[PDB]
Amino acid sequence: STVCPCNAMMEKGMEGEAGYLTGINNETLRPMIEITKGVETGYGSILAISDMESAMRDERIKKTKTVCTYCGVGCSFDVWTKGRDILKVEPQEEAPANGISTCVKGKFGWDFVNSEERLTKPLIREGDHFREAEWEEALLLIASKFTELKEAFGPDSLAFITSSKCTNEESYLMQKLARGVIGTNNVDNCSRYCQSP
Amino acid sequence: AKAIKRIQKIEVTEEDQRKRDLREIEDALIDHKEAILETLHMLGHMNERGVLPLLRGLFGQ
Ligand SMILES: CCCCCCCCCCCCCCCCCC(=O)OC[C@H](COP(=O)(O)OC[C@H](O)CO)OC(=O)CCCCCCCCCCCCCCC
Ligand code: SF4
Ligand code: SF4
């Protein structure tokens, strides 16, 4: 899909969603294509119109670089989106770790971002359920509980784990909260299971 | 009653005049409720059809 020059081998995410005139139904898009084939005499003018349609796409299509979260190859690619849905994962030749190389995960596995199962609000364990609580009240609850177990049994009885799936800033903030805030050294990640030996 | 000519106009501050004119605009909206609904549907159907996004690409780039 990445190496195809034309739209011959292209992701279904782009199909019917990239531009404005391409979401038209095929039963009513193909006759328009035949009309334009039989109408325009020189490719220059309709090519300019297609360049305008490319500029059209440029506004709605957001192309931002990112690095795949799944595995440690750290392949970097642009993620062509239209609002919130992910249309394409386009690698670039300038990508250091992969260039154009990509796997199924990093190039077609990003539907989890827009998944409805995603936790949009903080959840607090109320009785035997998870109540959708406000951000501020959840923050106050966690802070108060951590202060309680920090000033009762000491910070040494506090242990926090950062995700190896999160950015460097995230793990640095975990370890700073443990040491520069809580005062404990009990921190780890999946690397204890993965890269510690 | 004696002879008095001067008129003490009521002190309508900026807040009161703004509220009165906003109420007038709201009443005008009320008179054209169906028209406003039709125009909102206009925008909705244009945006769904991509006409409004097409113009958004036209005027953004
Ligand atoms: C007296 C009447 C005067 C009218 C006077 C009318 C005056 C107003 C202008 C109307 C035409 C605007 C431009 C429409 C074309 C450009 C935009 C476009 O290409 O947008 C694609 C979209 C595909 O739709 P899809 O849903 O498939 O795709 C949705 C998403 O793109 C993907 O999700 O086009 C449409 O929706 C069609 C819109 C209406 C076109 C009407 C053409 C004839 C108008 C004149 C005759 C009217 C006679 C009425 C009376 C008989
Ligand atoms: S953008 Fe034009 S030239 Fe490229 S694949 Fe699509 S139709 Fe063909
Ligand atoms: S694109 Fe594939 S190989 Fe590259 S980092 Fe993501 S999951 Fe790993």
> In this structure, are residues A192 and A164 in contact, taking their beta carbons and an 8 Å threshold?
no
Q: What is the DSSP letter of A19?
A: S
Provide the 10 A C-beta neighbour count for residue B48.
11
Buried b (16+ CB within 10 A) or exposed e, A78-104: bbbbbeeebbbbbbeeebeebeeebee
Residues in chain B with CB shorter than 8 Å from the CB of A23 are 50
| Alpha carbon of A162 to ligand 1 centroid (Å) | 53
C-alpha–C-alpha distance, residues B2 and A170, integer Å: 83
Residue with tokens 């709605």: A60
What angle separates helix B14-31 from helix B33-49, to the nearest 10 degrees?
80
C-alpha–C-alpha distance, residues A159 and A183, integer Å: 10
Tokens of A114: 């827009």
Length of chain B: 61
C-alpha–C-alpha distance, residues A162 and A178, integer Å: 10
Report the greatest alpha carbon distance in chain A: 84
Residues in chain B with CB shorter than 8 Å from the CB of A20 are 50, 53-54, 57
Cβ neighbours of residue A36 closer than 8 Å, sequence gap 6 or more:
A46
A interface mutation test: which of B48, B49, B56, B61 has the most A CBs within 10 A?
A: B61
> In this structure, are residues A60 and A82 in contact, taking their beta carbons and an 8 Å threshold?
yes
Tokens of A123: 């959840």
Resolution reached, in Å?
Answer: 3.3
Q: Which atom, in ligand 2's list, is nearest to the CA of A8?
A: 5
**A57:B57 CB<8 A:** yes
Report the greatest alpha carbon distance in chain B: 73
Provide the 10 A C-beta neighbour count for residue B1.
3
Enumerate residues preceding breaks in chain B (C to N > 2.5 Å).
Answer: none
C-alpha–C-alpha distance, residues B30 and B33, integer Å: 5
C-alpha–C-alpha distance, residues B52 and B47, integer Å: 5
C-alpha–C-alpha distance, residues B41 and A15, integer Å: 27
C-alpha–C-alpha distance, residues A22 and A14, integer Å: 10
> In this structure, are residues A56 and B61 in contact, taking their beta carbons and an 8 Å threshold?
yes
> In this structure, are residues A58 and B57 in contact, taking their beta carbons and an 8 Å threshold?
yes
C-alpha–C-alpha distance, residues A124 and A131, integer Å: 5
A110 closest CA partner among A134, A131, A135, A80 = A80
